Design a protein around this ligand. Structure first.
Ligand code: HEM
Ligand SMILES: [N]
Ligand SMILES: [N]
Ligand SMILES: [N]
Ligand SMILES: [N]
Lengths: 499, 499, 499, 499
């Protein structure tokens, strides 16, 4: 016997023992007589249109693929539950946090970022760590990453950043010039770049990394009082990373290392868990925070904003069919129940639009009707109707316009969003110069130790060496701005590489 | 009180009784605080991206429409059952005919042909009468019309015929030149044209017309013996047509006369029914039939092939949501259970491909998963997987390749198709000159009487008069070939029209 | 002969002259031997998969349809130019107004609102009048209607309104209860409802109605100074409407009356034209305006805001292929060149999102690449790439990320939007009670005379009579609020109808 | 100065002289003022819907992806020409072979089979080698592989085979049980499996492998005489393969080795070329051939059917934009011009349907209108119209029905297909046992030498060892059926592996 993953079919057959195999049918339910030989006129004659068994099956095979995610295409999923362990109702009225011990089903998908569906798991890249909470007040999607920060602070640079990280438009090859030209021209990326090229750049699977909402969010309590927060979910199995050489080897020996590791852990009862925490910042504190508290390239120092325990995230169930339950999973940051709201973070603001938008394209207009995406713990009732692939009863014969005098769904004022006051000129404010080095300097000098600082520079140099000289110069210049020793170490390695 | 249809919302509300209205939510299940006022900065300020209630609802509104059927776009639907009244098991082993008293759920859609979704019901045009039988051996779709024949006998002319019956590619207007240039060039259309311009061209709603499979099909019994057949389902409400005047009036007074009539009939308990019969022709008789027995422009004389009773079709349930149960309804002639097979009819052969093909486009790759199209009386099990908008569990973790040693679905020999022999060259055999007038003459002289022929010619002339003279000449010539008087009577009317 | 539209093919044929017919080919360009007879084994044998001429043609026929517009599905289009006649550069720097005599090609689509693609042209309903200006600074889409106002003032009520104006979700029938329950519950609709049921409710074709931008927009001059404006394009052919009796007759006699009328006018050289004017309101006046100047249910009194001439719109070219040039036409209000910007109008704000969004669904992600939608008078250069049905060269091998050090496209600071200041809480401000009767009373008393008021009430009562009594009561109450006589006259008619 | 691929942007930059970069615009051609900062209310305020620069760009980014090819997803493309070097007009009248020296432009795509878009190039797998010839008689797509044979001989097993070669439906991992259970149950796969696991399984890039049409095709000359044939295009660069070790290293060192290799070869003027040959078998010989001449698992012995020189295939132009010219490339085996036709090969017959079918899905209904797929050397003229994303003029106002009296396109009888006679019952004839070992034995003992036989078995055992013992057993029995020593050697290796 081998690992559970390897024995998937062996186990399927066993848990069905004795049962006679089902009758093979066409999509329309018609039994098939012989699905191994085509219908022709004579043994060596032409294929007939009358062979509807062939066409029915072949037409579906021809339509199996859907567009992969534009970003985070390579991933793994699992299911489990969220359990409240601490009371934070003084900050949020969200039903999901209602009482200690309360359980809410969750769906989770882990992923890399730049690689396509056939890429390797063990490569340097941030890691997606999305969590869907099926709450009574609808779904709450906490679409986080394995890092508290990100490369940029304005959504307008996101398509460009992603493009720079992917393939050259003409050669279809990874392009270090594209990667470093963008990063060198946008130094705000220094913080996450430093994290990315540190040991945390290649987690040992998905179970040995933390998750973060990254963005500053807003929590509102029953009294209508609001505070800003940060979500953190630390791994209970400990942080563990793969060395550059081990990652390269696994890259070809098992491009699906993360998928396999997660499935086997769950299959053997070694359920991975994370502890969910929040950092809280009052509106007054946000007004005096040393940096823009809504700047995604900044963290909230733990010393000034301690982590507050909330609950546990446990994954105890593997997908039964990957395509249906994982490939089709759709997380929308805009999916927020009462008690949880967005902050002015320019990046988060852009995401409120982007995810539902790309989902309507990738999956379809009615993607929220796909089982794994349906808020099955809530009661969906509204005035939306039709659309392609309309499932269920499409809300039957219920009045389809609001307001109406026929007892159809009514809005609930208690669900009204928290009112914040805003004043200012409507314009495109430049945020390109919002302190790009201070916290980066702290990370390099205080967070990292000597051994990791060494690896960090070697990691950066090893990749940056392939960019043109003028690009290497600008990049080094930015690293020197963070700390002269930082840029100096990289330059020395670069000089050597440039042989 | 008014008609049941008019009180649709009134009844829905009364049905709700004192039950409190559901909470209005977003597609993601999040309760909505105020869905009547957008989120802005100040009462006269800009709209915020942060208003995800607006975007969620509007995005779905923006995607409500799907392509209408390329033909038969305007229609009505209802549900009910099929009941076997006689034993025809000597001809077919199909489970749907298994035993007297046997009940099978059915779905039916009635429709016109050329008009778009907003067109009128009471216009001259054939009428679609498609019946979906949800059997244990999968769905059987008998996609019939209100006529036993059709305008052409080879599928390659179908797109052109439909094009000629629709809008001019430049002006987007109905075009008499297109309609009659095609018909005058393809005389095989004389039989159905004669039927179309007779009183039968405009039935009084959908309950007062017959249904026909039109094509010759093949039935196979338990002993493997086969016979060719024709399906006929006659209205138990009696044939009833609308005069040209009444139809024209209803066209603007009630473009949805057929829809309203059917819904009210069922709503008031006046369930419409049809008696299903079959005509049987042995392979020996097919060999000596005076015409090509598989020629869609020919009927099988009842005197030689009597109608044999089989059962009854009853519609006793209105759809609850039109879009979900009717607009998304998909009938595939290729959906035939064991015991029912296609004949060599070139037209039928072509339809075997066209319907599932257009359905994958109009509805989606997984259209057979839409509730109303699912063969819910059968167990769908096969090696097909994925595709956009994949519902249910996508057959879970079952082995997805055949053959396999893991107990997955197996084909069933008993479901093998009947063996028919064919010999000949592979070529495009011309059928354009396959007797286009004989049966038309019988129809004109025997089936119709004097007053009916008079109206027939008046109806033809009234439309043909708008076509160019050279087209009128050729058209009249064809009618003259059927019978000198047929043509002369039309020419006289034409001369009058052309002043 | 007959009208030019009827002779479309005749002319095409004559245009062909002595030229011989081209060779008929498959979509792949392969010459076809016989496209009138299918490939079979023997004259009465099975159809072969090998008949790829059949499949190629049928598969395309099966995919001819695309979803119709969610609203304004029934329409007609034409092309021509816009010519500046007056200098308004003091208000707007838009290149399209650059200098007197300057011409800019335009595309226009006229339409009804509620009816589907097969509905009749001459029915009571607003009329769409969209104009696309192909300017050097990109396309400017002025998506107007034949009315200066609308039924609602917040986009959140739009989907509901449209739903109430269309078919009952269960019966698929027009529903007076839906129509009037909505209007009676939303009194802000009184203004446009009065206009709709007035004689203007049914224009005589598209050439005899005015066009309006409806919304308040913003104009910005070269000095960066801004003013608010309203766009008005009055018909030079003069206002002309159809009586209720004539409209009903044309509804069945010629449902495409509007299409035909326009095509023939242009085909005979009787090019229809409109004079473009604008009303200008300074920001100072906007703050003093007695009503919300951004309220779509309000007009700007001509006495206080005189119509200022700008130019002329001329339609002198019919479409060659309707589907390609008209059905695929896409107008996005968000398509505004420098010099023209939106106002805070809550309705306009919503439209900024809805159109490009619905277009990505109805047509496709790359719909701006469809010839008629391409901004061919400008140079499209950006960092957008790929997507389905990607035409041209997809911008070749140009750097696809911004910023970059490789000379790819750069933004132009001069195109920056005008900066306005806004202050206030972020909330859903209720606008349901923003004076719903004042201007409606002036319309009823001044704009209309006695005979018109007579018809207005007859048309209203003629439709409202079919709604339930409790709905009739609410509606009348609203009319009475406008003017006691308005309501009492309708009630008198209703009492008679409810005979 | 690096390799040409790496300097793609550097070169794009310098080829624009000192030209001012283009103005960055929206998709609608509107100039952008600042595409680096979003529009908000105040420096730290919410994002506005009014920022249509953001939405336009983000919405397109959200739709960049299209489904990857269901198979052969990972590939590289290039363009060039085909030049006739010898006269084979006595066999085929195809215009592409008209006269010595005649050049026809071609498009080519190379690929692996099982791996997704992000997979590695240097892995064991067949190699796709599709060639599109843009001839005057339309496009001719010779969709070949780097092997003259395939694993199966009936299209009904194709979806299953591909499924077995891809990922487990539950774990999403490669599955050796799936791979070998299928192959062991279907020994017809022995021939191609032997080739696949030989050194030819991992070619050194795309330039060092042969191309094959694989299937038996039919050629028809000017006199209507027909012969069967096989296409062979041998590499002029010579056969060269990568060792298992090197391929593994490259798998992670450069997942895009094939892409880069081909691009640089062409960029440096080292244009790769292939010599096209054909084998000819008369209809008489096909009747006596010891195997089914249309059996895809069989080759035609060169000794009895020598290679006949035809012309040269040369690739001398790289794609400018990969997505537009390569990812969107569509090859349809059914695209055959007069002079070239299919044979009864059950696999080929199935492919006649599948490719256009999947293309309508993957790309869109009008995928033949995408530039790279358009038969631009031909004149497309037919009665096909509309469909989503309809480009050009949709054939303008030309009559859209056939036949017609208005001079629209007409079929050309000279393009009629060659007539073959067939006699037989319409049945599903078994081909599972059509000699699965004979040619495999000659390959093993005669085609390979001792050294490569050693490698063959090691490669097989190295993969087979991970499957369950019962599967290994069955697979070994099949190899033993080929030759006792074939199975013996593999079994010895398996024993060593299974400890
Ligand atoms: C918040 C309110 C509104 C929303 C959300 C909205 C939404 C829509 C949508 C989704 C379409 C279909 C577009 C297509 O498929 O091409 C449409 C069409 C149209 N709308 Fe609106 N609309 C609104 C208000 C109005 C108003 C006030 C006007 C006029 C000033 C207007 C004029 C039109 C016209 C003329 C068309 C048809 C354009 C064409 O001919 O292609 N709409 N609208
Ligand atoms: N992302
Ligand atoms: N049809
Ligand atoms: N609209
Ligand atoms: N393939």
């Amino acid at each position: 016997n081998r690992d559970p993953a390897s024995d998937q079919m062996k186990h399927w057959k066993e848990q069905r023992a004795a049962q006679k195999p089902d009758v093979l049918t066409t999509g329309g339910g018609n039994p098939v007589g012989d699905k191994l030989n085509s219908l022709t006129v004579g043994p060596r004659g032409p294929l007939l249109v009358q062979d509807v068994v062939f066409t029915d099956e072949m037409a579906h095979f021809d339509r199996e693929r859907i567009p992969e995610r534009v970003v985070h295409a390579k991933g793994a999923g699992a299911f489990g539950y969220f359990e409240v362990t601490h009371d934070i109702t003084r900050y949020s009225k969200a039903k999901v946090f209602e009482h200690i011990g309360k359980r809410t089903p969750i769906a989770v998908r882990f992923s890399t970022v730049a690689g396509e569906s056939g890429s390797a798991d063990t490569v340097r890249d941030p890691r997606g760590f999305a969590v869907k909470f099926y709450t009574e007040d609808g779904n709450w999607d906490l679409v986080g990453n394995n890092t508290p920060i990100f490369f940029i602070r304005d959504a307008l640079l996101f398509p460009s950043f992603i493009h720079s990280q992917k393939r050259n438009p003409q050669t279809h090859l990874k392009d270090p010039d594209m990667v470093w030209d963008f990063w060198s021209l946008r130094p705000e990326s220094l913080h996450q770049v430093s994290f990315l090229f540190s040991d945390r750049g290649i987690p040992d699977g998905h179970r040995h990394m933390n998750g973060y909402g990254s963005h500053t969010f807003k929590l509102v309590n029953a009294n209508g009082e609001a505070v800003y927060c940060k979500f953190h979910y630390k791994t209970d199995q400990g942080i563990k990373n793969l060395s550059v050489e081990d990652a390269a080897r696994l890259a070809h020996e098992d491009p699906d290392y993360g998928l396999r590791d997660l499935f086997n852990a769950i299959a053997t009862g070694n359920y991975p868990s994370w502890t969910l925490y929040i950092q809280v910042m009052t509106f007054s504190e946000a007004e005096i925070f040393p940096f823009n508290p809504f700047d995604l390239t900044k963290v909230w120092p733990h010393g000034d904003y301690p982590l507050i325990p909330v609950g546990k995230l446990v994954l105890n169930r593997n997908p039964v069919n990957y395509f249906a339950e994982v490939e089709q999973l759709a997380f929308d940051p805009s999916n927020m129940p009462p008690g949880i709201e967005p902050s002015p973070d320019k990046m988060l603001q852009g995401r409120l639009f982007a995810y539902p938008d790309t989902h309507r394209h990738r999956l379809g207009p009615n993607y929220l009707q796909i089982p794994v995406n349906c808020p099955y713990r809530a009661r969906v009732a509204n005035y939306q109707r039709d659309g392609p692939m309309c499932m269920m009863d499409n809300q039957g014969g219920a009045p389809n316009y609001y307001p109406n005098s026929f007892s159809a769904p009514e809005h609930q004022p208690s669900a009204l969003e928290h009112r914040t006051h805003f004043s200012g000129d409507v314009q495109r404010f430049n945020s390109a110069n919002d302190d790009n080095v201070t916290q980066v300097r702290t990370f390099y000098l205080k967070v990292l130790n000597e051994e990791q600082r060494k690896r960090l520079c070697e990691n950066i140099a090893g990749h940056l060496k392939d960019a043109q000289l003028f690009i290497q110069k600008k990049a080094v210049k930015n690293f020197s701005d963070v700390h002269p020793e930082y840029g100096s170490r990289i330059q020395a390695l670069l000089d050597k590489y440039n042989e």
